[PDB]
């Protein structure tokens, strides 16, 4: 979810990890990732967006 | 789907045909253009409708008519569509637009009697056909000219 800057910073540098905000998620990102780790607030925002 | 296993729907995409790439392909050498002639040249071919000098069809035929500067075309609506509303509903150009039935009203809504009306409605429109007005009145409704 928007505002979790520290989570994004700690996660981005990992080779197997791709960080995206719930407001900015794309078909290509989801398909490329083998797994999707999403916070509860992120899932709520995704459902609202769609 | 997985990026390493993509698969288009069958028949969704085709392979471009490249000409002038060998004889066995079926379009080698002449590239399907034939032998010599005007159509075989780069940029060749005559303008559309040209007939090699015989008087073209449009030249043979006469011009006709004129366009009325004050022409009025009405968005047309029928009783079949009107059946989509409930009894007692107030049908209006705005109502039709919101329902999406008439996106572009042009000079205004005209109601025609192609279908069979079944609901009682108070219909407001620019014009009504005689049959349409009678059908609306017979259905217990009423018609008004905006």
């Amino acid at each position: 979810e928007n505002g979790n800057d520290f989570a994004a910073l700690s996660a981005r540098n990992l080779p197997n990890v791709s960080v995206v905000t719930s407001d900015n998620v794309s078909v290509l990102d989801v398909v490329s990732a083998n797994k999707v780790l999403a916070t509860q607030t992120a899932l709520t925002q995704i459902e609202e967006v769609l | 789907m997985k990026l390493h296993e993509l698969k288009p729907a069958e028949g969704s995409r085709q392979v471009r045909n490249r000409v002038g790439r060998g004889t066995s392909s079926g379009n080698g050498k002449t590239a399907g253009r034939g032998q010599k002639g005007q159509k075989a040249r780069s940029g060749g071919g005559v303008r559309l409708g040209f007939e090699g000098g015989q008087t073209p069809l449009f030249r043979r035929l006469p011009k006709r008519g004129f366009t009325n500067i004050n022409r009025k075309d009405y968005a047309v609506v029928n009783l079949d569509t009107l059946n989509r509303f409930e009894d007692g509903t107030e049908v209006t150009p705005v109502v039709l637009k919101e329902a999406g039935i008439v996106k572009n009203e042009k000079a205004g809504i005209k109601v025609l009697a192609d279908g069979e009306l079944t609901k009682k409605l108070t219909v407001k429109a620019a014009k009504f056909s005689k049959s349409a007005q009678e059908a609306i009145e017979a259905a217990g409704g009423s018609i008004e000219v905006i």
Partner: protein, 64 residues
């Protein structure tokens, strides 16, 4: 660029409900003393563009 319409055809033909083209008739300008009244009467009626001619000209009326 947008494909242009042939203005001469646009003036001389009309698109019908079935997708055909309605056209006038030739020999309806003058010299009516050289044609029988039957010819004039039957030329007064409009007609439709033939299949071959339509296949030649359709692209010029696509967006008529």
């Amino acid at each position: 660029p947008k494909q242009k319409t042939h203005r001469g055809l646009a003036k001389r033909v009309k698109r019908t409900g079935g997708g055909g083209l309605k056209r006038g008739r030739a020999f309806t300008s003058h010299r009516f003393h050289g044609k029988t009244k039957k010819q004039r009467r039957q030329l007064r009626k409009a007609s439709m563009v033939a299949k071959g001619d339509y296949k030649r000209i359709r692209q010029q009326l696509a967006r008529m």
